[PDB]
Design an enzyme around this catalytic site. Structure first.
Site, PDB file in Angstrom:
ATOM      1  N   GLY A 156      89.374   1.316 -28.693  1.00 40.83           N
ATOM      2  CA  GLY A 156      90.275   0.422 -27.989  1.00 40.83           C
ATOM      3  C   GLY A 156      89.811  -1.015 -28.002  1.00 40.83           C
ATOM      4  O   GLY A 156      88.803  -1.353 -28.636  1.00 40.83           O
ATOM      5  N   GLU A 157      90.559  -1.873 -27.312  1.00 44.46           N
ATOM      6  CA  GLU A 157      90.168  -3.258 -27.136  1.00 44.46           C
ATOM      7  C   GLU A 157      89.605  -3.392 -25.748  1.00 44.46           C
ATOM      8  O   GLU A 157      90.332  -3.678 -24.793  1.00 44.46           O
ATOM      9  CB  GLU A 157      91.350  -4.220 -27.377  1.00 44.46           C
ATOM     10  CG  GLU A 157      91.622  -4.450 -28.858  1.00 44.46           C
ATOM     11  CD  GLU A 157      92.805  -5.341 -29.172  1.00 44.46           C
ATOM     12  OE1 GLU A 157      93.698  -5.475 -28.304  1.00 44.46           O
ATOM     13  OE2 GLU A 157      92.843  -5.904 -30.291  1.00 44.46           O
ATOM     14  N   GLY A 158      88.296  -3.175 -25.647  1.00 40.86           N
ATOM     15  CA  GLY A 158      87.549  -3.386 -24.416  1.00 40.86           C
ATOM     16  C   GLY A 158      87.637  -4.806 -23.903  1.00 40.86           C
ATOM     17  O   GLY A 158      88.259  -5.667 -24.527  1.00 40.86           O
TER      18      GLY A 158
ATOM     19  N   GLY B 246      86.812  -7.656 -26.643  1.00 43.98           N
ATOM     20  CA  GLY B 246      87.095  -7.442 -28.061  1.00 43.98           C
ATOM     21  C   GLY B 246      87.206  -5.978 -28.431  1.00 43.98           C
ATOM     22  O   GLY B 246      87.377  -5.122 -27.556  1.00 43.98           O
ATOM     23  N   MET B 247      87.093  -5.677 -29.739  1.00 48.79           N
ATOM     24  CA  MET B 247      87.280  -4.325 -30.257  1.00 48.79           C
ATOM     25  C   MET B 247      86.046  -3.495 -30.082  1.00 48.79           C
ATOM     26  O   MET B 247      84.929  -3.987 -30.200  1.00 48.79           O
ATOM     27  CB  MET B 247      87.612  -4.362 -31.751  1.00 48.79           C
ATOM     28  CG  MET B 247      87.829  -2.988 -32.399  1.00 48.79           C
ATOM     29  SD  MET B 247      88.468  -3.155 -34.099  1.00 48.79           S
ATOM     30  CE  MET B 247      90.059  -3.845 -33.775  1.00 48.79           C
ATOM     31  N   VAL B 248      86.244  -2.205 -29.835  1.00 45.85           N
ATOM     32  CA  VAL B 248      85.148  -1.263 -29.758  1.00 45.85           C
ATOM     33  C   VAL B 248      85.541  -0.008 -30.550  1.00 45.85           C
ATOM     34  O   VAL B 248      86.699   0.412 -30.558  1.00 45.85           O
ATOM     35  CB  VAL B 248      84.602  -1.003 -28.288  1.00 45.85           C
ATOM     36  CG1 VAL B 248      85.541  -1.494 -27.194  1.00 45.85           C
ATOM     37  CG2 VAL B 248      84.191   0.423 -28.064  1.00 45.85           C
TER      38      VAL B 248
ATOM     39  N   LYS C 227      80.578  -2.339 -29.674  1.00 41.71           N
ATOM     40  CA  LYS C 227      81.556  -3.325 -29.307  1.00 41.71           C
ATOM     41  C   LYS C 227      81.280  -4.625 -30.064  1.00 41.71           C
ATOM     42  O   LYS C 227      80.129  -5.084 -30.137  1.00 41.71           O
ATOM     43  CB  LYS C 227      81.606  -3.522 -27.777  1.00 41.71           C
ATOM     44  CG  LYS C 227      80.435  -4.249 -27.182  1.00 41.71           C
ATOM     45  CD  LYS C 227      80.632  -4.377 -25.714  1.00 41.71           C
ATOM     46  CE  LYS C 227      79.401  -4.937 -25.048  1.00 41.71           C
ATOM     47  NZ  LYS C 227      79.581  -5.035 -23.579  1.00 41.71           N
TER      48      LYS C 227
ATOM     49  N   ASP D  50      80.709  -5.830 -10.551  1.00 47.61           N
ATOM     50  CA  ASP D  50      81.967  -5.289 -11.036  1.00 47.61           C
ATOM     51  C   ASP D  50      81.933  -3.812 -11.137  1.00 47.61           C
ATOM     52  O   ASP D  50      82.432  -3.209 -12.117  1.00 47.61           O
ATOM     53  CB  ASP D  50      82.419  -5.931 -12.357  1.00 47.61           C
ATOM     54  CG  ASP D  50      83.925  -5.839 -12.589  1.00 47.61           C
ATOM     55  OD1 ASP D  50      84.667  -5.589 -11.615  1.00 47.61           O
ATOM     56  OD2 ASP D  50      84.357  -6.013 -13.748  1.00 47.61           O
TER      57      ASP D  50
END
Ligand code: N5U
Length: 342
Positions: free
Chosen positions: A22-24, A27-29, A44, A139
């Site tokens: 997915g797009e974490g 960015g992309m992972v 990632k 978080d």
């Protein structure tokens, strides 16, 4: 270079057999097969260098995760980047692959009381180490709690972490805040910058409540609504707790509200273990000075099957980026990642 979804994902011959996840958050992972350690890993892709705030969060995470070594904190196994600062546009962070996370698990799985207990233990054991390093995660939420097939739990994403700074925690009313809304302590909306350890304990409290029922306990729809949801369950703060808030705008906002009664935890969670509810109450205490600390939480009767302070390690080496320009932070990212080059 390897391509995924028509974008470069250049992880070099070490890492093959890529699969999109997915797009974490930044960015992309992908997962990939690690040809050296003979296991699939998570990778990632980070592209932070045009923006000072993205450089800051990328550097913050790298510095923290490289110093920390703990079973319940995700490591960094490897960092891939170009051999020179001029050629470095992306950085790939390689971590142990974890089959799932508590967000995904909570959307379709009922947890047994034994799973809740064990998950909470591991969260608090990781958090003890983080706080012992004078770091705040800031978080904590289900999607940052990774789980493997045997339910080993690891805390993820240190991009919003800070060194604790309780003497500079005070601020005015409705001061904007970065971290995820449903897990934000009431004081963030009233008078706190989130620079004390008690902000993380509130988030853990929210996570515990969410484990008990598979629903977020305080699902605020926007910023001030979050406080509406909190007070809807805890009820109106006491005079003593109001007196702790010296800021007049925050104080007078709370005094303006109609009286709200505490909703008893055993009515909200009629199937929960009574010891889990006693610990929940202590983590979701309105006044952050009265809120239980991580070591007290580990020592609570709910966790007696697991509590063992000698097997709950602390950091050996506890920890200004805020105004370094992005050029300088790229250099520091380049330096912090150099140990992973041949
Ligand atoms: C911090 C969360 C995170 O990085 N992941 C969870 C979602 C899928 C991608 C990430 C993952 C999976 N296994 C390990 N890691 C770091």
């Amino acid at each position: 270079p390897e391509m995924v979804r028509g974008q470069v994902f250049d992880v070099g011959p070490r890492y093959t057999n890529l699969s999109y996840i997915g797009e974490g958050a930044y960015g992309m992972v992908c997962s990939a097969y690690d040809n050296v350690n003979k296991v699939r890993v998570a990778i990632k892709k980070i592209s932070p260098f045009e923006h000072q705030t993205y450089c800051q969060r990328t550097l913050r995470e790298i510095k923290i995760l490289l110093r920390f070594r703990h079973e319940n904190i995700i490591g960094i196994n490897d960092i891939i980047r170009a051999p020179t600062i001029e050629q470095m546009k992306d950085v790939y962070i390689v971590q142990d692959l974890m089959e799932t996370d508590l967000y995904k698990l909570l959307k379709t799985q009922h947890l047994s009381n034994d799973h809740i207990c064990y998950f909470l233990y591991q969260i608090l054991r990781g958090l003890k180490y983080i706080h012992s390093a004078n770091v705040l995660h800031r978080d904590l939420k289900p999607s940052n709690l990774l789980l493997n097939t045997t339910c080993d739990l690891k805390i993820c994403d240190f991009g919003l972490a800070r060194v604790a700074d309780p003497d500079h925690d005070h601020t005015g009313f409705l001061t904007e805040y970065v971290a995820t809304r449903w897990y934000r302590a009431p004081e963030i909306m009233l008078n706190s910058k989130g620079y004390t350890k008690s902000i993380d304990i509130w988030s853990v409290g929210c996570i515990l409540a969410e484990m008990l029922s598979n629903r977020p306990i305080f699902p605020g729809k926007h910023y001030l609504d979050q406080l509406n949801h909190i007070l809807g369950i805890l009820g109106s703060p006491s005079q003593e707790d109001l007196n702790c808030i010296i800021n007049l705008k925050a104080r007078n906002y709370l005094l303006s509200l109609p009286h709200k009664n505490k909703v008893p935890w055993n009515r909200l969670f009629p199937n929960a273990d009574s010891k889990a509810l006693d610990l929940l109450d202590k983590m979701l205490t309105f006044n952050p000075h009265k809120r239980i600390e991580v070591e007290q939480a580990l020592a609570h009767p709910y966790l007696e099957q697991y509590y063992d302070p000698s097997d709950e390690p602390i950091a050996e080496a506890p920890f200004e980026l805020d105004d370094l320009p992005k050029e300088k932070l790229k250099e520091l990212i380049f330096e912090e990642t150099a140990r992973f080059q041949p």
